[PDB]
Design a binder for this molecule. Structure first.
Ligand SMILES: CCCCCCCCCCC(=O)O
Length: 396
């Protein structure tokens, strides 16, 4: 349903849509048929829903001053450590953006800056890419409508699954679908480690099916495979091409930021506000066990908790028999129990399950003979996305 071959149904729909948007035409990012058709396709030519979607976007542009975001300067920590960059063009002339996820330190960034600034940095990238598409259109004399995004997963870690960081990427993917529909040609994933299917499963429901269908996972031969999309002379040497910085650096640091660990000197806090699924009392001299059956290795357990009334002990155990509850003496110790000041600073963490069995998170108040505790917690079993898992298996 694109420019050129619209049906009459579609051509009449487009004309009506254009008529219904007369008030907005002078302030649209572009008032051409290409622009309008993105909103129509996103809502199957339902004139009302398409209009609602576009008008919501236009309110978002006003609220966020998006026409001027290309000159917005983020906080120093985001300028220096929030990764990614625009570099090169694909064979059609679409701009390429490198998203260096694996080297990102989103925890350090969120402890040093706001979710709002991290999201605004990512919106800025969208606007920069759109401006680059327009410049390319003018230079090439034909419409360039989309960008190509490469996602470098080298370094992806349990550390990246910190719940507040994940909420950044989830919110961003929701914003992308609502405000930048059909702006990515492909989403090319390189250097995916074993953790990728679990990580991907956390964000997949926030992207549209059309976006998901454009994901391409590359294997060991990714450098050669990338050159099917992008010319070597448009690719950094780091990613298999011939482009360098003026000083010969193969990473093209003058265009692409590679993130890295945020120095502690930038931190403005060391934990953020959390929300919890459950609240329970743990009696004086007592304990609480939260059990989860893991059916295969590679599942990830992730938790967060706070206490009131004093500290709490916490460890992770693995049952040696299924059936009745076992004591800490009888179970295998997976993560040694320790006391945490979870009444002062909430705790969180994760681990990879190396075996199938019943994993038990044990909250220990047995040492506190006079004082009970109130405990709030969330404990989640994170499963792999099955398609991603199969694909990674299939690439050896
Ligand atoms: C093309 C799909 C990219 C998958 C990104 C999943 C990474 C989860 C980590 C969230 C974060 O730390 O920003």
């Amino acid at each position: 349903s694109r420019v050129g071959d619209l049906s009459p149904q579609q051509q009449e729909a487009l004309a009506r849509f254009r008529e219904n948007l007369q008030d907005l035409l002078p302030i649209l990012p572009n008032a051409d048929d290409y622009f309008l058709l993105r909103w129509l396709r996103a809502r199957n030519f339902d004139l009302q829903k398409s209009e609602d979607m576009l008008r919501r976007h236009m309110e978002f542009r006003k609220q966020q001053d998006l026409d001027n975001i290309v000159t917005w300067q983020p906080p120093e920590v985001i300028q220096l450590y929030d990764s990614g960059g625009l570099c090169g063009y694909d064979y059609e002339g679409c701009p390429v953006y490198f998203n260096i996820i694996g080297s990102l330190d989103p925890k350090g960034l969120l402890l040093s800056a706001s979710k709002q600034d991290m999201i605004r940095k990512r919106i800025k990238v969208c606007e920069l890419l759109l401006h680059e598409c327009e410049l390319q259109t003018q230079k090439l004399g034909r419409k360039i409508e989309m960008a190509l995004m490469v996602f470098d997963m080298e370094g992806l870690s349990l550390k990246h699954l910190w719940k507040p960081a994940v909420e950044v990427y989830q919110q961003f993917f929701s914003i992308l679908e609502a405000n930048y529909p059909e702006t990515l040609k492909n989403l090319i994933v390189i250097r995916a480690p074993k953790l990728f299917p679990v990580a991907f499963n956390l964000v997949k429901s926030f992207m549209s099916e059309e976006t998901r269908r454009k994901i391409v996972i590359l294997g060991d031969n990714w450098k050669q495979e990338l050159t099917k999309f992008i010319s070597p002379d448009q690719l950094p040497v780091e990613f298999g091409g011939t482009m360098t910085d003026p000083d010969g650096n193969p990473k093209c640091l003058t265009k692409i930021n590679y993130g890295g660990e945020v120095p502690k000197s930038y931190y403005l806090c060391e934990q953020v506000r959390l929300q919890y699924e459950h609240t329970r009392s743990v009696g004086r001299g007592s304990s609480l066990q939260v059990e989860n059956e893991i059916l295969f290795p590679g599942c990830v357990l992730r938790w967060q908790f706070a206490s009131d009334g004093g500290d709490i002990g916490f460890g992770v155990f693995l049952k040696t028999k299924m059936g009745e509850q076992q004591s800490a003496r009888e179970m295998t110790e997976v993560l040694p129990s320790q006391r945490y000041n979870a009444h002062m600073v909430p705790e969180d963490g994760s681990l990879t399950c190396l075996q199938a069995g019943v994993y038990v998170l044990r909250f220990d108040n047995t040492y506190s003979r006079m004082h009970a505790k109130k405990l709030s917690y969330t404990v989640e079993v994170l499963l792999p996305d099955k398609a991603s898992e199969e694909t990674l298996q299939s690439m050896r």
